[PDB]
Design a protein around this ligand. Sequence first.
Ligand SMILES: CC(C)(COP(=O)([O-])OP(=O)([O-])OC[C@H]1O[C@@H](n2cnc3c(N)ncnc32)[C@H](O)[C@@H]1OP(=O)([O-])[O-])[C@@H](O)C(=O)NCCC(=O)NCCSC(=O)C[C@@](C)(O)CC(=O)[O-]
Lengths: 376, 376
Amino acid sequence: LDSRLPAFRNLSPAARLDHIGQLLGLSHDDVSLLANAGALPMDIANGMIENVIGTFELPYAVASNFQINGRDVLVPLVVEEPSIVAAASYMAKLARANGGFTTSSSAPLMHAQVQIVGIQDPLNARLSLLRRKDEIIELANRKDQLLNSLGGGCRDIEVHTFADTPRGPMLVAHLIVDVRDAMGANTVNTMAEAVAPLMEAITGGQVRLRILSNLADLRLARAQVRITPQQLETAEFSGEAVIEGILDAYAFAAVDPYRAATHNKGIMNGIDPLIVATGNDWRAVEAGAHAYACRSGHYGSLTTWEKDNNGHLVGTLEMPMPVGLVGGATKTHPLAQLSLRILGVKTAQALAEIAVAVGLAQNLGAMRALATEGIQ
Amino acid sequence: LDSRLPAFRNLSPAARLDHIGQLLGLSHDDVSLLANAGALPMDIANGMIENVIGTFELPYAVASNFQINGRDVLVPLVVEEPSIVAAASYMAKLARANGGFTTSSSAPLMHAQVQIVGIQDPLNARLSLLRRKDEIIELANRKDQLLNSLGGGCRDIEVHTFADTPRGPMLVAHLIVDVRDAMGANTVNTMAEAVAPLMEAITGGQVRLRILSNLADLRLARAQVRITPQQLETAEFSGEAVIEGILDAYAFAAVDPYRAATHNKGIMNGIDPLIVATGNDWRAVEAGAHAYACRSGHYGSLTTWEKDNNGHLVGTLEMPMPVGLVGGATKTHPLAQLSLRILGVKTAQALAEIAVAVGLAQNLGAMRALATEGIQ
Ligand SMILES: CC(C)(COP(=O)([O-])OP(=O)([O-])OC[C@H]1O[C@@H](n2cnc3c(N)ncnc32)[C@H](O)[C@@H]1OP(=O)([O-])[O-])[C@@H](O)C(=O)NCCC(=O)NCCSC(=O)C[C@@](C)(O)CC(=O)[O-]
């Protein structure tokens, strides 16, 4: 696969769609999902959410030039805002010259929280739980046979205490669950509900919340990119001075939350449209991303930008990225299935890796434009 | 308008649409935009973002029972996830019994950032700017005579310094701009550009970034709700016990960022689909919401929950809410226009107020469920 797509931006939507279909070998049926409006049947839309009266369209695009660990990929994106697809594509083009994007990710581990109140001895109860870990882990894994046989399941438990709250001391257990190719909320909510009575028996507390955490900091995905000064040279500036201006923009986001919010918004301009294109939950991804940005107590940049010893501009993105290939709209929406076909992804973590590569490219594009814009 | 919609949940989408059209007095043409696929023509979609190959639908729904400052409203929502619309409607039904939602908002004030580097005397340069603030403000306002006629414009400037970054001292000016019914990005960006040469003259430094901040903490919208224990009573739980359980849930969110990220995600489940339905930029709203949530130096809850002197449950949501009635896809997308007609809003701050009421409702719905039978 060659994702360069020369001339794409100037082709008609039909000719774009034809080129995609040729490059990938999409069937006629696949192509007709995008050629004709209304690919989401109303009977399906009506079973997705409540009180449905119709459907709402956004444009569906493809970003070009992306390459992930040496493999070319085409990236579907659904969004209303201009410049995003272009910026991504152009930074992807530049990235290719130096090997594309390099990615990695954690195992697909999600937390389930079990909140326990009204214990007079929570610190002691925490050890009583930790001692009985294996028992709790076995109970968690009893019901979801499909998950286990696919090689997922509850791996471990950690327990936290919050002894100072206005509502008294709390204990909070986390089940740590490998959810394989799912986003995982239903899987872990189920397990949290299933172990709650047993934890209550061990601790003597009242269980309250039994619920996933969206701060999915054990489900991290990572991307890297490299850009050389020669690539960034403008009419106004040397490539070197552009790099320095990109580093200046980065330091500005790292110290000022007013800038960091905007900088990170730029990252999510790249990521959220992929999430939408694949039928995934963008509120989950957003909450994980921004909560992770302020894990230190200070709201900072999710990306890093540096100059290496060769003088090259090197960027990183590492962040929570809980996404699924199965479940909900990703299965039921015909175009979500088409997107996954276009992407070629075999695991949810592969989809996560593509996401962070696009977020990183979008951030770079935004910074480059802001740094190279002349003073009027 | 009566927003109650008896049996709406169980009508077909065609019947729900006909019913809305009758309540609102929508034209046959308006109803047609939802009764048929393809309300977003391809020529418009192709002009909205780059590399467009088609469109992508999500379901379009309406939440029922909402009442804001004593007026019933119907709330359009576009999203892929079940239970959101139902939960919002159900909590809105409860809220009606005690007066509905009560809302307010600030003026629609946005920050434009102007980053200045290369100054050995940033603290001095700050006072030189403030000494000449009236000129800077007059200059920003020459740039947009129409906004000023509409009753907006640059109101003030603030200046922040970061004298010790790893990239050297920086100074950052903020233009504080009343943007009326726009989200405002384009307006404030334009002003930042206009004042940049003047700030360079004053400070002797070099302007880098000129750009809005999405941390729109001078554009706050606020909602309140009240719920009695009688309303929350179940077969398994007294209403008083449910209220205690909700307060335990809130305290858990206030202390633990693992919980707060999820709690806040639930609020955004309510808000973002109204943002999408109105053609607004949901990445901006998200970034502002979650960055505001950590302004204290700890990532906490956007909502508050308390029990008043009567034993009643009272909740608040105050947050940044930068949305527009004009600008971008809000104008361009025929269904964004229709949403605004359904909502009946006459200013952007009115839309913002609706948004926080729906966010507050959604949070309440999640918590009520999590404190009683559980989410599953
Ligand atoms: C989903 C409900 C409301 C069902 O509720 P129910 O148990 O079926 O109660 P009901 O069936 O008697 O419904 C009563 C009212 O709910 C509304 N309603 C009820 N069903 C529908 C429907 N199909 N379509 C439209 N409206 C509906 C409707 O207004 C109805 O009034 P009535 O029928 O008496 O006039 C209930 O189970 C509930 O409130 N669940 C909330 C939990 C939830 O799933 N919230 C949604 C978002 S998930 C989320 O935010 C993530 C989370 C939870 O992790 C955030 C966090 O942790 O904080």
